[PDB]
């Protein structure tokens, strides 16, 4: 199938309560593989997947060097952003960053990303052409001009098309037994009597990887788009995911309802009835 690699990082100022915290995380698809926490004692990029552990001490040294320098850069970036906005130093602020690449099943480059958010809102983003920036406001427009004058886009193009796809490919091969798997959902319905004239039907999906899935309710062939409670896809903690969709049902009307389930691990969509 097609795959992705992402790195996410968050710097948060902790005014009066210490120096900014930096946390970076690396994913291949819905699987985490590395982490760096500035607060941790280790002060190193650390393994988070069995298949990354095989990388020699050189990898861990370089990765540590790159993430530490990024940590310190983002600490100055918070100070720059405070200045751009004339914000009080009493306030706590967050810079988030995401970068990485998509590849196809044959391993070819499909898409590159390199984008920032300041205080949970878009700041600057590399456009799909990997040649220009989308700046969200006047402060980001200032950053954008500095980045145009410095040819930063060209550095990111070269990383996203180069090191990023090479790394993703190596990880996908080394972690083939895990990454290349697609665990279809174990599905079931439950019934919970509420009152006299009502009960909840709940449709479960358990133990699926990857996280993408669709769950849908119908009352005899017709969709039930607005009476369905649908929770967020949540991690089971073991590599897999869970989700449920529920509808409230008039007593004696359970037979009218069907649950519908779509996942890439499923040759054909499941239908469930009580």
């Amino acid at each position: 199938g097609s795959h992705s690699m992402r790195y996410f990082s968050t710097s948060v100022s902790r005014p009066g309560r210490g120096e900014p915290r930096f946390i970076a995380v690396g994913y291949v698809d819905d699987t985490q593989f590395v982490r760096f926490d500035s607060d941790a004692a280790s002060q190193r990029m650390e393994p988070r997947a069995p298949w990354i552990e095989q990388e020699g001490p050189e990898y861990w040294d370089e990765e540590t060097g790159k993430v530490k320098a990024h940590s310190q850069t983002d600490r100055e970036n918070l100070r720059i952003a405070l200045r751009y906005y004339n914000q009080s130093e009493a306030g706590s602020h967050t810079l988030q960053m995401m970068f990485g690449c998509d590849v196809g099943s044959d391993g070819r480059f499909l898409r590159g990303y390199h984008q920032y958010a300041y205080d949970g809102k878009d700041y600057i983003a590399l456009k799909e052409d990997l040649r220009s920036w989308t700046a969200a406001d006047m402060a980001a427009q200032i950053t954008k001009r500095k980045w145009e004058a410095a040819h930063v886009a060209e550095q990111q193009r070269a990383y996203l098309e180069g090191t990023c796809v090479d790394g993703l490919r190596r990880y996908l091969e080394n972690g083939k037994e895990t990454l290349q798997r697609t665990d279809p959902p174990k599905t079931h319905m439950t019934h919970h009597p509420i009152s006299d004239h009502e009960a909840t039907l709940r449709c479960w999906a358990l133990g699926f990887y990857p996280a993408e899935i669709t769950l849908t309710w119908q009352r005899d062939g017709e969709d039930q788009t607005q009476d369905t409670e649908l929770v967020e896809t949540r991690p089971a903690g073991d590599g897999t995911f869970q989700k449920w969709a529920a509808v409230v049902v008039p007593s004696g009307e359970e037979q009218r309802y069907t649950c519908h389930v779509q996942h890439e691990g499923l040759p054909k969509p499941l239908t469930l009835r009580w």
């Binding site: 790159k66 970036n77 950053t143 980045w147």
Partner: peptide, 9 residues
Amino acid sequence: QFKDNVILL
């Protein structure tokens, strides 16, 4: 593999 990039805002 993390990017090799010091970039300031």
